[PDB]
């Protein structure tokens, strides 16, 4: 609301893995891969 | 007293311009039958919005 609280935002290399394995060693997975850097061009001073 | 005081002014224009822009984007993806895949190549900008 309103118009404070301070939170934190992660940047860098982020990786999340959730595997599942079969009897034949087949792998079913959900994978998140993120690469994010800071950009001076689109930063706002407030 | 009977009279007149008047005149005209003018400007000259000879501006001429062109513009061309091209782009191709070729993303590619893989996903399993019944799954979902999301892909983003770009950036994030800060937006100041609140309840």
Summarize the structure.
Chain A has no helices and two strands. Chain A is elongated and about 55 Å long.
What does this 3D model show about the protein?
This is part of a larger assembly, with 2 copies of chain A. The first copy, chain A, is mainly beta. The first copy, chain A, has no helices and 2 strands. The first copy, chain A, has strands spanning 12-21, 27-36. In chain A, strands 1-2 form a two-stranded antiparallel ribbon. Chain A is elongated and about 55 Å long. Chains A and B meet through loops of A and loops of B.
Biggest interface: A-B, 10 and 8 residues
**How many β-strands of chain A, per DSSP?**
2
Shape of chain A: elongated
SSE arrangement of chain A, N to C: EE
Bin the strand percentage of chain A: 35-45%
The number of helical runs of chain A is: 0
Q: Strands across the major sheet of chain A, in which order? A: 1-2
Oligomer: part of a larger assembly
Beginning-to-end CA distance, first to last residue of chain A: 18 Å
Radius of gyration from the alpha-carbon trace of chain A, in angstroms = 19 Å
| Strand-pairing-aware structural class of chain A | mainly beta
Query: What is the percent of helical residues of chain A?
Result: under 10%
Largest sheet of chain A: 2 strands, antiparallel
Protein name (chain B): Type II and III secretion system protein
Family (chain B): Belongs to the bacterial secretin family.
């Amino acid at each position: 609301a309103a118009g404070q609280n301070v939170t934190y935002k992660d940047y860098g290399i982020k990786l999340e893995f959730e595997p599942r394995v079969d009897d034949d060693n087949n792998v079913s997975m959900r994978v998140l891969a993120d690469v994010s850097d800071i950009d001076p061009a689109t930063s706002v001073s407030l | 007293n009977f009279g007149i005081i008047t005149g005209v002014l003018s400007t000259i224009n000879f501006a001429l311009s062109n513009g061309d822009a091209y782009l191709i984007a070729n993303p590619q993806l893989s996903a399993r039958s019944g799954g979902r895949t999301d892909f983003l190549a770009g950036g994030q900008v800060p937006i100041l919005q609140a309840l």
